[PDB]
Symmetry: D3
């Protein structure tokens, strides 16, 4: 329910998008909770990318050294955030195209249901039907 997460940030104005795509794959393999890019504008007319890494506070040394080894940045900044997390468990639901795992997130009186992307995309590809069609079929099917 209650948690803390480390946020690590770096401003990269001398890194290519190809190399940035490479480092995001490296950071997820290293176990980061999340990684995202933000387009930013830096001095001297430089379109840059901000790299943000979320992870366990005890992975600070791991994720820092990864960033310092694989990107061009001279330094990183990091800070601890708090987190409020819903409770998760999974349901298998039968849809017109097969079973789809549905994520049931709960927090006190709040309950919502999210079909898992992976199941829906695999069924959309196999039966040559749209992703949104399989996803919406799972939503209807989770009504009971």
């Amino acid at each position: 329910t209650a948690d803390a997460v480390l946020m690590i940030e770096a401003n990269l104005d001398d890194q290519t998008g190809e190399g940035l795509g490479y480092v995001m794959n490296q950071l997820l393999t290293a176990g980061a909770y999340d990684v995202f890019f933000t387009p930013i504008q830096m001095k001297k007319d430089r379109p840059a990318t901000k790299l943000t890494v979320l992870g366990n506070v005890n992975d600070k040394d791991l994720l820092t050294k990864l960033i310092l080894q694989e990107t061009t940045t001279i330094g990183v900044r990091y800070q601890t955030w708090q987190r409020t997390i819903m409770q998760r468990h999974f349901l298998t639901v039968a849809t017109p195209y097969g079973d789809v795992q549905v994520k049931v997130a709960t927090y006190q009186d709040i309950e919502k249901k999210m079909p898992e992307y992976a199941d829906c995309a695999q069924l959309a590809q196999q039966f040559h039907i749209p992703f949104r069609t399989v996803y919406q079929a799972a939503l209807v099917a989770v009504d009971q």
Copy 2:
């Protein structure tokens, strides 16, 4: 003058812009100081949107549960920032097209004046003249 604000963030890769526009209206109604979207790029080629909520630190539970109920996110992250705020009071100034309320923000020796958008937009619409024309008329008129 001195203050603190809570920042709540969430990365939404499975939420539509229509639904995001809906939640920003909900968050302002709930009394958030500010809400803004940042376009971000997440794993698996997902163009995502970061939702940032600013508000009173005592509204953490209110704004969290709102986000957890109305968006698709499983968790939120939050942290406390400090704030330095200028002093505000309002002046009514007479322009060629009517009275326009002007915000006078002061901080120590710093003084600046901002015509209120709402008055300027209403007068621009009624008299079928550009917004920037009414706004600039208010700026000239605040010189005395």
Copy 3:
């Protein structure tokens, strides 16, 4: 008046921000009407930049060769747009800090006035006052 303008675009996922600042400076010196960057998202999790150059139709070969020379792109795409341009004339107005050229743009029933950035920024730095202060003083002086 009426015109036609060439638009050249390239999607750059293998370019650093440092190099992009260089090519924009190169292209404006060579006479592009305008150059701008658009953050885009490309394949393989790449935060990329779209380079757009606007310029004279007869300068197509110059600006193309410049992009192919200075960026990593293998190709450029281009198309001609039509343009509608306002008529310009300039007012020099006397302020507390010096003369400021004011651009007066007209189109049919449209008349608008923009103090020139170069004048305002130079006098703000030279007289050690905010930019907004010189900008607003020119507006006041264009009242007559």
Copy 4:
């Protein structure tokens, strides 16, 4: 069906966000098919906005004059695009919270169904439930 659409663009580095919200509201009221903002980066370290307006070819003069009147741009560029449009029909479906219009779009072998945002947002506010709850109920009701 087949169509042609006018695209008008302008790069605005001398416009506030407040004024841009005003002109988008002005242009949609005047009958633009659509208006959107794109964040771009311009010369002299300027975070700018590209304004794009889509509209009827015969409305070119109206939308141009509107942009030249309400923004700071000296010119606009425009070009005509071709369009491929799906065929529309609407289903009104009965939900636990009222009727919801469902847009059924078809193209060759394509059939897709989108609950109308206006219906879902209005019933969610009126019945004090999440938007997603009304949206999903319409999906369930379109199962028949």
Copy 5:
């Protein structure tokens, strides 16, 4: 060489990021030359995404139907651009970690050399060294 390229665009304010990653993967598999996302801002406070697809002029119907099938858009807009393409040839160079193909692009007086990302990323992972290390080694080896 000279070419012409089809550009197809759609403004998506009712699409999730998960679904957008799916359609970009679908469109590249179907033979689009390129697909990219642009963050845009639409009406009713909607953070949206513009989908742009570049492709062969004769593939217009395939890519259109794909977009109409997999996204929520009711229509697409398209136009043909001209293209200027550099001439390509490839150098395979021997590095400390294996062979790396180097793309040598030429145009009039222009000669530039780009190590192939696929080669560099594969050898960096296989030999457990940074990407930059394999990239720079190919540059060194292309010195002869």
Copy 6:
């Protein structure tokens, strides 16, 4: 090695890009470690810009008053981050076009080398060769 940095942020929806470019130049002159813009979307259909300032924690008063004097914002938010910084020293390396200073950043076992943009851009301009060509020549030359 270990450090702390102050982050100051402000959301500007009533500031022009020209004025924002002006303030970024002012903030770097005042000694900020870094300044960047992030495009954001705020309420009432406003494309806005987030201004982020990084600097020494003891420059809080300096950088705040600068922002409050030169922009339109009523308040700033700020927080302290931690930093991990690599060790820096400079090498002059001989390339085919002159000496180029190369930044050698080290952190424990990590060593990487970055040619300084300023030297590479000056040599590219003087000899009328691409930036990337001089930068890559410096990379090859730093191999010994």
